[PDB]
Amino acid sequence: MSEESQAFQRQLTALIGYDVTDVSNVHDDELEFTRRGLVTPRMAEVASRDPKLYAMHPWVTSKPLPEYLWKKIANNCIFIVIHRSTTSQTIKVSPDDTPGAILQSFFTKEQDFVLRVCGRDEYLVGETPIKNFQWVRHCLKNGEEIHVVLDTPPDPALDEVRKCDRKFRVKIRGIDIPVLPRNTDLTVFVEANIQHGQQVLCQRRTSPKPFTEEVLWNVWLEFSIKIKDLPKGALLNLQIYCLLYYVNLLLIDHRFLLRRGEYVLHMWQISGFNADKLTSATNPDKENSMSISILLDNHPEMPNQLRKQLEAIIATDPLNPLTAEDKELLWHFRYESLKHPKAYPKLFSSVKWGQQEIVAKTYQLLARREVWDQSALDVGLTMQLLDCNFSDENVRAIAVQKLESLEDDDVLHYLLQLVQAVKFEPYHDSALARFLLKRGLRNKRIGHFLFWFLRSEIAQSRHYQQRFAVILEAYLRGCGTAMLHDFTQQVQVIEMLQKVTLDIKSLSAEKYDVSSQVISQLKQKLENLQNSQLPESFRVPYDPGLKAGALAIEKCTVMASKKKPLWLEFKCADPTALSNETIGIIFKHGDDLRQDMLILQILRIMESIWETESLDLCLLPYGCISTGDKIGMIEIVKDATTIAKIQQSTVGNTGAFKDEVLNHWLKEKSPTEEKFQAAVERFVYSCAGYCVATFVLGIGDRHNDNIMITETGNLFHIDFGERVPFVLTPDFLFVMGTSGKKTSPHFQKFQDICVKAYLALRHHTNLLIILFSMMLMTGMPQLTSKEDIEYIRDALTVGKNEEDAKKYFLDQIEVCRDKGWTVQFNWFLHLVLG
Numbered sequence: 001m002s003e004e005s006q007a008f009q010r011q012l013t014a015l016i017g018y019d020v021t022d023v024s025n026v027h028d029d030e031l032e033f034t035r036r037g038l039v040t041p042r043m044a045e046v047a048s049r050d051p052k053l054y055a056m057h058p059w060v061t062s063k064p065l066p067e068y069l070w071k072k073i074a075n076n077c078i079f080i081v082i083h084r085s086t087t088s089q090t091i092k093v094s095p096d097d098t099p100g101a102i103l104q105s106f107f108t109k110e111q112d113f114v115l116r117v118c119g120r121d122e123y124l125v126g127e128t129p130i131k132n133f134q135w136v137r138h139c140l141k142n143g144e145e146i147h148v149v150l151d152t153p154p155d156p157a158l159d160e161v162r163k164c165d166r167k168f169r170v171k172i173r174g175i176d177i178p179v180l181p182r183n184t185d186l187t188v189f190v191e192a193n194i195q196h197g198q199q200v201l202c203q204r205r206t207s208p209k210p211f212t213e214e215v216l217w218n219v220w221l222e223f224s225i226k227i228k229d230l231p232k233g234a235l236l237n238l239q240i241y242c243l244l245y246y247v248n249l250l251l252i253d254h255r256f257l258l259r260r261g262e263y264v265l266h267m268w269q270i271s272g273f274n275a276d277k278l279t280s281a282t283n284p285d286k287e288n289s290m291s292i293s294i295l296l297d298n299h300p301e302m303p304n305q306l307r308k309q310l311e312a313i314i315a316t317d318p319l320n321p322l323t324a325e326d327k328e329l330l331w332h333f334r335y336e337s338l339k340h341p342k343a344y345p346k347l348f349s350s351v352k353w354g355q356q357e358i359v360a361k362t363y364q365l366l367a368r369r370e371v372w373d374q375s376a377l378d379v380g381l382t383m384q385l386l387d388c389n390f391s392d393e394n395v396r397a398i399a400v401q402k403l404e405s406l407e408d409d410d411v412l413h414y415l416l417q418l419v420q421a422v423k424f425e426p427y428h429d430s431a432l433a434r435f436l437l438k439r440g441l442r443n444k445r446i447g448h449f450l451f452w453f454l455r456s457e458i459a460q461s462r463h464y465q466q467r468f469a470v471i472l473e474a475y476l477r478g479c480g481t482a483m484l485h486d487f488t489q490q491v492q493v494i495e496m497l498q499k500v501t502l503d504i505k506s507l508s509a510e511k512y513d514v515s516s517q518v519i520s521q522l523k524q525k526l527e528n529l530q531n532s533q534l535p536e537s538f539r540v541p542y543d544p545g546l547k548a549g550a551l552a553i554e555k556c557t558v559m560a561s562k563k564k565p566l567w568l569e570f571k572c573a574d575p576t577a578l579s580n581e582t583i584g585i586i587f588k589h590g591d592d593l594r595q596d597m598l599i600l601q602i603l604r605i606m607e608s609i610w611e612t613e614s615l616d617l618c619l620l621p622y623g624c625i626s627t628g629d630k631i632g633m634i635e636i637v638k639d640a641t642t643i644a645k646i647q648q649s650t651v652g653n654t655g656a657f658k659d660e661v662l663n664h665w666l667k668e669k670s671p672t673e674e675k676f677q678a679a680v681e682r683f684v685y686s687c688a689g690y691c692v693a694t695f696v697l698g699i700g701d702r703h704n705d706n707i708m709i710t711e712t713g714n715l716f717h718i719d720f721g722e723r724v725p726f727v728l729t730p731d732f733l734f735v736m737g738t739s740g741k742k743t744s745p746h747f748q749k750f751q752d753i754c755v756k757a758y759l760a761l762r763h764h765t766n767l768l769i770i771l772f773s774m775m776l777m778t779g780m781p782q783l784t785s786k787e788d789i790e791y792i793r794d795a796l797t798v799g800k801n802e803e804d805a806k807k808y809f810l811d812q813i814e815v816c817r818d819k820g821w822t823v824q825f826n827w828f829l830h831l832v833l834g
């Protein structure tokens, strides 16, 4: 082992937040085998990348320019302000002009110069029409001039990458736990399940005994299923009831061998279904967890009416249960089912997984996948085949085959969900894990978020940290020296702030009070940090194109309400930046932020859905990245206050909410009457957007301290970590021009945007349902695969015409008109004072 290679792994360990070489919690070599197995797809991906295009990371799209962006263009003309030094020359450009074509027309008014966005590491390069660049469309939407600054293309050198018919049986020896309470007198038994895709194939149980520090049986549990019949990805799921503890063991190993021998397995406890329950990983807490000793000792045309029945089944929502009758119909006419890509999940749920002959015919059916291979890619459908309900390698691989076709743009929309879907994988090395490795290594933006996404899990999931660490390691070994330096700097900043937060909060404390002593203790520690020492600059984890510089220590403070996070402000590292404005980041500690990260991601999905449906509901996507254990970073949105603070501006610590105050605030903050009309329209659209989005996700009923607004009328939600559908209070309606059933032209405008936006999401029901199911399974702890998931269906009005749905949503608007300020008042009494 090279002393420099040893140093390189020590670097990687700190970048990951876990040692992949650490063997304290294994019973096989699956992790090491995956570490080995991933060398090839990494090497194949580093070898195939354009060093130049990788260095500049052009962020683009194939999707058409939306209607709301074409109308903003005046006469097939786009203005680009190209900067040199003091000088800046404006240029009229056609939307279809490629970056080379634009450079030459400027060179007219030696040829190794590139166009770069002012204030960021964003390059308008490669052969793409200017309209198809994501920064360009972003500017068009929200109104800023397109400022470029002609410079030298980055040096790719900096990106250099370091050089048998027997029945199956198990003997439950006993269960051991170091300590327990005294007591009380309780019963205890072991349940052994043979699972595959959450489907219980076979089940046996031990004789119940009293719950003491040690319990033993030494009883064999003979199962009906034969050894030859065990499918790959099948699990032995061992559970203890009084459900208190669980643990899993893959029956078929990674080398396709049956599991055999003595097994002491440290179990996970339940804190009273979810992705944590499927884990092959063992509880690393050997001195405090419940254990289990086990023993294993044993190589792999339709008639008219039925066609109607088949098609009716196929038509149902993914949360619709299949009867034996549906399963027998789907299976018998499997070659007719195959002619419906949308029938694949329901068909694959009708497979006799615990019967080799069927699994083989499934593989026979799958070999001729003409329909599936030719089918127009469906993320929703593709993802249904990647959840908990599918344990088969081949079924999961066909979903990954369709994802191969997804462009960087879309991979960036569903990246988190795709990283979460690795929790539903039977084995560490999988088609999906390799897909994420390939994409990450291929593009710099995808690679950055993959790093953070994987790091959020490694830091706070004992159940999948081991698996995720091997994927991060594999990625880190191929991103390049430059990215490894960026990642070191970001990690340095995070670890140093963590310490500052772990010291500042070690002298207070939560509840009433912000203290001048604490703000003083804060600024002191940052003054000590900046010299010396911390990184000079760093890429903002939620906005990698941005580079943060020195701290504005005086602008930094400690925030107001109840779990004490840092309001940091940084100078920008790019001196070619347009504005002198700071980079504001909230460094929060004490809370897991993965759920907030998830909510915001699904919102970003909804904007892209609305984009495809030609709509723009002006949602405000602000950065929010979970950066380690119970720690993270939130983007500070400029000129924005909470709704509640607008109520305490006129009024105070009540309670007594006034109708006129929001419209009052907006005119006070709008410089011109022209700007106030723009702010009133931006409000109407953004209010509508959050009314539908929050309603669909079932999180509409929030306090106004959790709803924020920009001085430009942009409404947005924060802090996601009597009842109403959403928040459409009298203060919002007053901005629209109404007061207690007094319909206005802007409230009429509003209702229509709402209904257009609602029907637009309804056209993507199955996608939203699958995204919502995956979120509850991988995001939050234990949730019901039946009522909890079922809300989304009801909210989306599944099985209704557009007119009934149009009505449904208008009724919801009226429940908000009926309750007015009531719900907000009740929130104010519960949250503010018990």
Ligand SMILES: CC(C)(O)C1CCN(Cc2ccc3nc(-c4c(F)ccc5[nH]ccc45)nc(N4CCOCC4)c3n2)CC1
Binding pocket: 559, 560, 565, 567, 586, 588, 596, 622, 624, 634, 635, 636, 637, 638, 640, 641, 642, 645, 717, 718, 719, 720, 721
């Ligand atoms: C400086 C001073 C006077 O305290 C201000 C008084 C008013 N507050 C409002 C406030 C009060 C509380 C706030 N809390 C959060 C926040 C949070 F604290 C925890 C999780 C989160 N998820 C999403 C946002 C978020 N995020 C805020 N943002 C600031 C604006 O940009 C988006 C993120 C946030 N803002 C801002 C600071």
